[PDB]
Design a binder for this molecule. Structure first.
Ligand SMILES: Nc1ncnc2c1ncn2[C@@H]1O[C@H](COP(=O)(O)OP(=O)(O)O)[C@@H](O)[C@H]1O
Ligand SMILES: Nc1ncnc2c1ncn2[C@@H]1O[C@H](COP(=O)(O)OP(=O)(O)O)[C@@H](O)[C@H]1O
Ligand SMILES: Nc1ncnc2c1ncn2[C@@H]1O[C@H](COP(=O)(O)OP(=O)(O)O)[C@@H](O)[C@H]1O
Ligand SMILES: [Mg+2]
Ligand SMILES: [Mg+2]
Ligand SMILES: [Mg+2]
Ligand SMILES: [Mg+2]
Lengths: 532, 523, 60, 520, 39
């Protein structure tokens, strides 16, 4: 009966399949969570090595035909797009919550009560996070940012050499500082040009105070070092004149074709002379440049760069104070050019970086830019360093946007599990088991950390639970909730002093995403797969 | 069928690291055949159908198709090392292989890779500090020292019998390549030293011409072929009547309009020719074609024209003579006329005309002419000359010298062993392990020379224990302990530093892989 | 519900589930039109009407 | 180069292999999860020939499944061992093993030593065995009817979750009388189980002698009386037909005189043997070898009954019931080697001819006549009868039974939880998990009828902590009651055997680290 | 990666059903048999 033309399940089989798929997805990226984890490798069919361990990239480049797997992948992608850090911890927490809710579902419990208990526990945990906040302005500031950057870059390839990369990231963030409409200061990212070039080691990658273009010079006869130049940004191709489709040329007299052919170049010559009439030295053209314009720029003694990106031109005009002019027209009917909209730079020297040259722009007079030239072995290490630098920049931006630091290492999860366990005794209904399962689901982070560190897991868990239980009672010892956990010795250290420093908005968003994923999946009890 | 992924193979654990170490050891054992002056040459067969007979470490590795990711990473780091400094392509691979082979002893002793990477970085920092401390300066004004350095650097290739001239050739090429434009920028590009390969003749006929050598011929036999002091000019635009991209049409209704247009075309051609012959030139070099009327006008004006040239050739000609390429004939001016010539003779090298621009005032671009047997010998000579030029450029960019062979390695090993006694904890065993891993180059040199390492190794180890005994190496020709100060073997410091940095980076990158995922089809 | 092109849809309304089921029997192909008409007219109770119709046809 | 092992050898690590083994063993528990409590059902297995196999016991289900997994074969082994030992709780041991595996799966995935888990399992099993032996509650001297009442109660308890649950009070007395009349060594092979097509469950009778199906007759079978008052049975073993003496013989006759002499002497020997068999005063002749038509016609003229092609088991049962002996030769037929009965008839039951030999005071065996369905029903009835017989035999050999239901498991879990609050370290978590896994019996018993298992388990835990020792579950009352007063008794050795088998299976599964497979 | 493990012999050919659908199919088959053996 029931002609559906496909395949279907029953009730518990689909739930078991989803739980197994979530467990497999969690175990796929369960060896690169803590700072002691190693990286993975992704090879395609043609032979392209991809060494990475951020989690989001591995989930995106996995291609799994499972609904729960695709849901987890899109959740990790949304988490990386909204924040950028903590893409695997949220997935692991969601998988643990699903595994814990499966046991309650198998115990003849309605999923609505479990969902309500999970929501109540999540709300209580969110309300409890605000109690453990530390003011960022009350500390030192620079040291706190350095510690946060070192913590964010601790699970990458530059974990050992984190004393210089963190300072470089802090300097780049302080340089790229934009002000809003006379209110709160902003910290825009994805604007610093992160170049990748093979050469020496990674310790020689200094910070370039200014901008760096990934293009070469046009003609070989142009100088490569101009002191106190004028940047002229253009948004039109420097080619010869060409009529439109609706405007044709019908030569009726032989005494006019030569004049037309001469004027076709004389117009461009006059335009070039009017452009260079203000005394410009650096001219950037996003389109094409003919040979006549190159010869004119060589004879006039000025540089010319062709095929420039739009975002790079906008950043250059914003840093130097210039204005991108798409045309030479004004408020009348004559094409002129003023000198008040010319970006003044300083030293524009072209440097060769391993068999290739690139034009660098130093600081100007309007704003301050930032450029990072990462150096490493091949392309995989350069991509890994770029990803680590982007993650560190995102973490620093999220920390500076919300002055609120929270210690890490697994103490916050244990404190939340203790608080939810102590609060579950005040309900008295069927949601107590749901709250207890929500509290026990947060203890998977210390277990995974101890597994990756190859240390005593049960002993450390018991020690953390015994140390956090004494912090709730006895108000005379309320400073025991900032002990953290160490992976190099296996004992609680200072942590909150200067070890781990992570924001709270990231953790709140990760917990909310995990709760939403556990809610949107537990409400599934039937699957209908049609045949193509 | 209800599975998560399709045709996916995931492998994790110690097996991936073991396979990577085995592949690295195999690559190191394959590349170790070409090392030292007592080594032998190989022969590769490219899928195109040619013959690759050389001895460089990068030219042989680039013609080997592999499938393991470790081998691909090794090829990539070797290509980056060859493109960075130019020399030292096999030593870095051998050092990386040895460092990855000596690292498996600790991985089987339940040791975490983070401590291993920390010890590797701490050893790299100490090695860099020692290499910077044992740096010996050298003067750049002495030509004999530079010639000796070049000869000691090229004593391994097959030019060991002709380095008496190749050294001077490379020195002249380096002296002519260096050019200072505007500002305080001193660039040393290699796109202006064109190397020509002509089969035939003896190897002693090679020299350095003060100019260039274009493989072209005159357009008409009535033009001149031997000029004393000509005025070579340059062009860019074509010398013929072309159409227009503005979609133009000439609607005519009379009868003499065709004749009027045909006469106006010739009048415009004659006007352009008169605008070209304005400051009385001699040799016209254009990049496009030249019509017959312009050729006849230049013959009547006794002007030589050459068509179909390249952009790099035109740039080299402009750099050698001292002029600039002009696109419009009406804007020739006066400073754009090149008067740096002195000899323009067109000879024949095996039924083929060649243009020779010799004897210039102050040329900044030369063309090296090579005369050998077939094409493989010419390619090998060109590669050796390029390596010598790169070594000379790296020496001129950093006036630092360090004793080569095996003295610097033993000195660094002794300095690391004498400093490892103050360390404690788990960061002492890998330090002492990588401190003795630098002896893989002298051991291989001794094995390739006299194949008696069990005595020479301990003889060199017992000698470097003294105070003033840091420049004692091993002669690869005979096989005895000799001083590097009296032998004359020297090497730059930047090349060794780059080699060490690349080896350490490759070891760090390869010591952090424990998972292999293949079967996702990229997209 | 998973279609042939690979689109996974999760819905709780009976009308959408019946439309995405894609049946082949006329007795089942009339119920989807009935649910569509009920959702167009009223909007709610798209599953109660189908249950009532099935119960009546079973009691018949 | 040359490979090490054979090309095509599958290998595995440790933690993933153990996880896969646990996941594979968790599926076997779902096959015998519904067949447990009284409200449970049964399964239907179809082989490759098209024959249905309906059986509620988990042993037959596991045997008809044909599992090829190396880790899933541990449940079949312990199931067969439990069926051969006592033959009762075949699914409880598998459920307990699956619960222990599911409880230790997180402890294994976290990173614990398997030796500590094995030691904890052994200690918990020893403690449970000691506690069960302590609270065994046995008697030393009882009345004559008290033992029969206990046997009937045990039979009714064992036949509660079977197919003949509606007639559990009728088969109890039958199996009691069958086991009580089984000599002293308890010979299970002496009980005959016959299946005749036709009749209902109430038409099943239990005879006090022997009964077998009618063999192939000849032409002189309807000429002899089929009813005798006090006859004499003579169990023989020689062929009664006209045939040659030996297969390796040769007669070289001369003339027709010796030929006719031998021809007459053959019939003379035949008649002498038939008279020697008849001179013993017998009336019923039973032999394993087929009887010819000559002897059948000779025995019908003297009003005597005869039947050939008697099986060995039927002949042995008849000899043990009457009190005769297997006589090979007919030259020593006295009076102490002949059987004796009180009545012998031959009626038509289900369209088949059957013989009865009831009325033997010195009999030590019986024969069961199971009716009902056709094949599957009769097989299930025979399985239930065998299970009840084994339960009664165990209750006789051990005379130690405890309260049934989920009271013993709850008491053991409470004792293990109370004992876990003394030994510190990591040993407390393992004992706690072992105690929590023991509560899967009442949950599965209450979930088979659609009841709130959580509230019932909480009430049972509260009653066990507030005391209130033999408090179990209830199906008809939809609550909890005292199983010791509800006439629910089960053998205590069955629980010990199941616990030991589950512990051994768990230890063997945990001890598995690397699995190596070979082609073909 | 959850690799499927082989449990029952020839699992890619046999089919397993729950229980309610099997009971409904058996009831429908019995009703059809009774309707056929009714005239
Ligand atoms: N230096 C450190 N000391 C202690 N714990 C750390 C350190 N670095 C990272 N961690 C822990 O590792 C976990 C994962 O951090 P991270 O790698 O930034 O996120 P993800 O694993 O999602 O990429 C965090 O919960 C944090 O507690
Ligand atoms: N004549 C020589 N005397 C001493 N050492 C030498 C001599 N020739 C080569 N070597 C040493 O052998 C090493 C290998 O050099 P070579 O094979 O020419 O290039 P690569 O360094 O790329 O292998 C060098 O580091 C050099 O110090
Ligand atoms: N009348 C009853 N009252 C209480 N419990 C019962 C009753 N009948 C069976 N049980 C319980 O059901 C469980 C299953 O017993 P049974 O089906 O006879 O064998 P198995 O344990 O092999 O399934 C037993 O553990 C027993 O405690
Ligand atoms: Mg991170
Ligand atoms: Mg060399
Ligand atoms: Mg509604
Ligand atoms: Mg039983």
């Amino acid at each position: 009966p029931l002609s559906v033309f496909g395949d279907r399940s029953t009730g518990e089989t689909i739930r078991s399949q989803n739980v197994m798929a979530a467990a497999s997805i969690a175990n796929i990226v369960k060896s690169s969570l803590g700072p002691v984890g190693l990286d993975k490798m992704l090879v395609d069919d043609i032979g392209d090595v991809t060494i990475t361990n951020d989690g989001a990239t591995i989930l995106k480049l996995l291609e799994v035909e499972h609904p729960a797997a695709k849901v987890l992948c899109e959740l990790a992608d949304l988490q990386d797009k909204e924040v950028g850090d903590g893409t695997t911890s949220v997935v692991i927490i969601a998988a643990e919550l699903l595994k814990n809710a499966d046991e309650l579902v198998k115990q003849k419990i309605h999923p609505t009560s479990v969902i309500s208990g999970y929501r109540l526990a999540c709300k209580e945990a969110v309300r409890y996070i605000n109690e453990n906040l530390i003011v960022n302005t009350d500390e030192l500031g620079r040291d706190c940012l350095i510690n946060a950057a070192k913590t964010s870059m601790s699970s990458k390839i530059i974990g050992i050499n984190g004393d210089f990369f963190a300072n470089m990231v802090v300097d780049a963030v302080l340089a790229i500082k934009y002000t809003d409409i006379r209110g709160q200061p902003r910290y825009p990212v994805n604007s610093v040009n992160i170049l990748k070039a093979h050469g020496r080691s990674q310790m020689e990658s200094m910070l370039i105070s200014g901008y760096a273009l990934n293009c070469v010079v046009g003609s070989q006869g142009m100088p490569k070092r101009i002191v106190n130049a004028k940047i002229a940004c253009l948004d039109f191709s420097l080619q010869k004149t060409k009529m439109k489709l609706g405007v044709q040329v019908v030569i009726t007299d032989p005494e006019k074709l030569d004049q037309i052919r001469q004027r076709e170049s004389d117009i461009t010559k006059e335009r070039i002379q009017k452009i260079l009439a203000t005394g410009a030295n650096v001219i950037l053209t996003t389109g094409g440049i003919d040979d006549m314009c190159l010869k004119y720029f060589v004879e006039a003694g000025a540089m010319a760069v062709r095929r420039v990106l739009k975002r790079d031109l906008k950043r250059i005009a914003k840093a130097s104070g210039a204005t991108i002019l798409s045309t030479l027209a004004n408020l009348e009917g004559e094409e002129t050019f003023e000198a008040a909209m010319l970006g003044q730079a300083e030293e524009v020297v072209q440097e060769r970086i391993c068999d290739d040259e690139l034009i660098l722009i130093k600081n100007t007079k309007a704003r301050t830019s930032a450029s990072i030239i990462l150096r490493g072995a091949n392309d995989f290490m350069c991509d890994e360093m770029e990803r680590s630098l982007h993650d560190a920049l995102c973490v620093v931006k999220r920390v500076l946007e919300s002055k609120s630091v929270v210690p890490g290492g697994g103490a916050v999860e244990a404190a939340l599990s203790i608080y939810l366990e102590n609060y579950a005794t005040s309900m008295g209904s069927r949601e107590q088991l749901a709250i207890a399962e929500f509290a026990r689901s947060l203890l998977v982070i210390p277990n995974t950390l101890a597994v990756n560190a190859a240390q005593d897991s049960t002993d450390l868990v018991a020690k953390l639970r015994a140390f956090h239980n004494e912090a709730q009672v006895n108000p005379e010892r309320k400073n025991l909730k900032w002990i953290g956990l160490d992976l190099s010795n296996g004992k609680p250290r200072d942590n909150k002093q200067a070890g781990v420093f992570e924001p709270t908005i990231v953790k709140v968003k990760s917990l909310k995403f995990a709760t939403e994923a556990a809610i949107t999946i537990l409400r599934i009890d039937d699957l209908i797969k049609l045949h193509p | 069928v209800l599975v998560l992924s399709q045709n996916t193979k995931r492998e994790s654990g110690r097996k991936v690291q073991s396979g990577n170490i085995n592949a690295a050891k195999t690559i190191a054992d394959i590349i170790r055949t070409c090392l030292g002056p007592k080594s032998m040459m190989k022969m590769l067969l490219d899928p195109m159908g040619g013959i690759v007979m050389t001895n460089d470490g990068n030219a042989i590795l680039r013609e080997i198709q592999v499938q393991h990711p470790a081998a691909k990473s090794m090829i990539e780091i070797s290509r980056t090392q060859d493109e960075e400094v130019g020399d030292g392509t096999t030593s870095v691979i051998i050092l990386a292989g040895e460092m990855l082979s000596v690292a498996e002893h600790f991985l089987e002793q339940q040791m975490h890779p983070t401590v291993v990477i920390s010890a590797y970085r701490k050893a790299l920092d100490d090695m860099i500090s020692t290499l910077k401390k044992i740096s010996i300066p050298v003067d750049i004004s002495d030509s004999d020292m530079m010639l000796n350095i070049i000869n000691s650097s090229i004593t391994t290739k097959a030019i060991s019998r002709w380095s008496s001239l190749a050294c001077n050739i490379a020195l002249d090429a380096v002296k002519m390549v260096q050019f200072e434009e505007n500002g305080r920028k001193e660039i040393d590009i290699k796109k202006y030293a064109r190397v020509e390969k002509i089969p035939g003749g003896i190897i002693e006929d090679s020299c350095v011409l003060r100019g260039v050598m274009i493989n072209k011929d005159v357009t008409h036999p009535r033009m001149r072929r031997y000029i004393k002091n000509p005025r070579i000019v340059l062009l860019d635009s074509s010398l013929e009547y072309k159409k227009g991209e503005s979609q133009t049409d000439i609607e005519i209704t009379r009868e003499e309009d065709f004749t009027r247009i045909l006469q106006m075309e010739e009048e415009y051609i004659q006007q352009l020719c008169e605008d070209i012959i304005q400051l009385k030139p001699d040799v016209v070099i254009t990049e496009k074609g030249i019509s017959d009327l312009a050729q006849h006008y230049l013959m009547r004006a006794n002007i030589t024209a050459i068509r179909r040239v390249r952009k790099t050739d035109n740039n080299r000609i402009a750099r050698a003579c001292g002029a600039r390429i002009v696109s419009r004939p009406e804007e020739l001016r006066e400073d754009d006329v090149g008067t740096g010539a002195g000899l323009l003779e067109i000879k024949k090298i095996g039924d083929e005309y060649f243009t020779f621009i010799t004897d210039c005032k102050d040329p900044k671009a030369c063309t090296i002419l090579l005369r050998g047997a077939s094409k493989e010998i010419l390619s090998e000579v060109e590669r050796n000359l390029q390596d010598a030029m790169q070594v000379c450029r790296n020496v001129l960019l950093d006036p630092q010298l360090v004793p080569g062979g095996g003295a610097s390695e033993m000195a660094v090993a002794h300095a690391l062993t004498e400093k490892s006694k103050a360390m404690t904890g788990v960061e002492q065993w890998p330090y002492r392990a990588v401190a003795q891993a630098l002896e893989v180059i002298p051991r291989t040199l001794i094995q390739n020379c006299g194949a008696s390492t069990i005595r020479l190794l301990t003889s060199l180890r017992a000698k470097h224990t003294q105070e003033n005994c840091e420049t004692w190496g091993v002669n690869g020709e005979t096989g005895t302990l000799v001083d590097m100060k009296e032998l004359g073997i020297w090497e730059p410091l930047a090349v060794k530093l780059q080699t060490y940095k690349t080896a350490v980076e490759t070891a760090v990158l390869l010591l952090r892989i424990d998972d292999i995922v293949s079967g996702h089809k990229k997209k | 519900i998973q279609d042939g092109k690979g689109d996974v849809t999760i819905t709780n309304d009976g009308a959408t589930i019946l439309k995405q089921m894609q049946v082949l029997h006329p007795a089942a192909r009339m119920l989807v039109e009935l649910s569509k008409a009920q959702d167009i007219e009223a909007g709610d109770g798209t599953t109660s009407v189908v249950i009532i119709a099935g119960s009546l046809l079973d009691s018949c | 180069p040359v490979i090490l092992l054979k090309e095509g050898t599958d290998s595995s690590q440790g933690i993933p292999q153990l996880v896969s083994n646990i996941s594979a063993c968790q599926v076997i528990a779902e096959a015998v999860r519904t067949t447990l409590g009284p409200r449970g059902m049964d399964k239907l297995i179809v082989d490759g020939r098209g024959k249905a196999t309906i059986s509620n016991d988990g042993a037959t289900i596991l045997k008809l499944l044909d599992v090829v997994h190396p880790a899933a074969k541990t449940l079949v082994d312990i199931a067969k061992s439990q069926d051969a030992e006592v033959g009762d709780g075949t699914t409880s041991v598998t459920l307990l093993a699956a619960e222990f595996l599911k409880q230790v799966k997180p402890y294994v995935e976290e990173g614990l030593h398997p030796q500590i888990i094995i030691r904890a399992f052994r200690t918990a099993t020893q403690l449970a065995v000691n506690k069960i032996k302590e609270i065994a509650v046995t008697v030393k001297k009882a009345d004559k009817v008290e033992q029969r009442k206990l046997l009937e109660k045990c039979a009714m308890t064992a036949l509660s979750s079977k197919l003949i649950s509606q007639q559990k009070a009728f088969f109890a007395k039958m199996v009691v009388d069958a086991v009580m009349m089984l000599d002293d060594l308890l010979q299970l092979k002496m009980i005959g189980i016959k299946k005749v097509q036709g009749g209902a469950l109430e038409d099943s009778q239990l005879v006090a002698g022997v009964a077998f199906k009618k063999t192939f007759s000849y032409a002189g079978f309807e000429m002899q009386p089929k009813k005798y008052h006090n006859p004499k049975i003579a169990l023989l073993n020689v062929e009664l037909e006209l045939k040659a003496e030996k297969d390796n013989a040769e007669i070289r006759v001369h003339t027709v005189e010796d030929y006719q002499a031998i021809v007459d002497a053959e019939w003379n020997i035949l008649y002498d043997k038939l008279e020697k068999i008849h001179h013993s005063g017998a009336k019923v002749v039973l032999s394993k070898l087929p009887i010819g038509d000559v002897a059948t016609q000779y025995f019908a003229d003297r009003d005597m009954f005869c039947a050939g092609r008697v099986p060995e088991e039927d002949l042995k049962r008849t000899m043990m019931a009457c009190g005769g002996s297997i006589q090979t030769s007919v030259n020593a037929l006295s009076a102490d080697v002949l059987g004796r009965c009180q009545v012998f008839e031959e009626t038509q039951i289900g369209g088949e001819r059957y013989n009865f030999f009831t009325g033997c005071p010195k009999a030590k065996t019986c024969t069961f006549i199971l009716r009902g369905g056709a094949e599957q029903f009769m097989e299930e009835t025979e399985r239930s009868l065998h299970d009840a017989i084994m339960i009664v035999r165990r209750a006789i050999k051990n005379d130690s039974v405890v309260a049934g239901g989920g009271a013993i498991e709850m008491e053991l879990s409470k004792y293990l939880r109370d004992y876990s609050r003394t030994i510190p370290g990591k040993q407390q978590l393992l004992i706690g998990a072992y105690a929590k896994a023991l509560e899967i019996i009442p949950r599965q018993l209450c979930d088979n009828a659609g009841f709130d298992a959580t509230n019932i388990l909480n009430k049972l835990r509260a009653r066990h902590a507030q005391g209130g020792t033999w408090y179990g579950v209830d199906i008809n009352n939809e609550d909890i009651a005292d199983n010791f007063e509800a006439f629910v008794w089960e053998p205590a050795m069955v629980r010990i055997n199941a616990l030991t088998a589950a512990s051994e299976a768990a230890c063997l599964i945990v001890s598995v680290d690397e699995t190596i497979k070979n082609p073909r | 990666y959850g690799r499927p493990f082989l449990i029952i012999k020839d699992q890619d050919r046999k089919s397993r059903l729950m229980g309610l659908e099997a009971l409904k199919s058996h009831i429908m088959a019995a009703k059809a048999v009774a309707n056929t053996m009714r005239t």
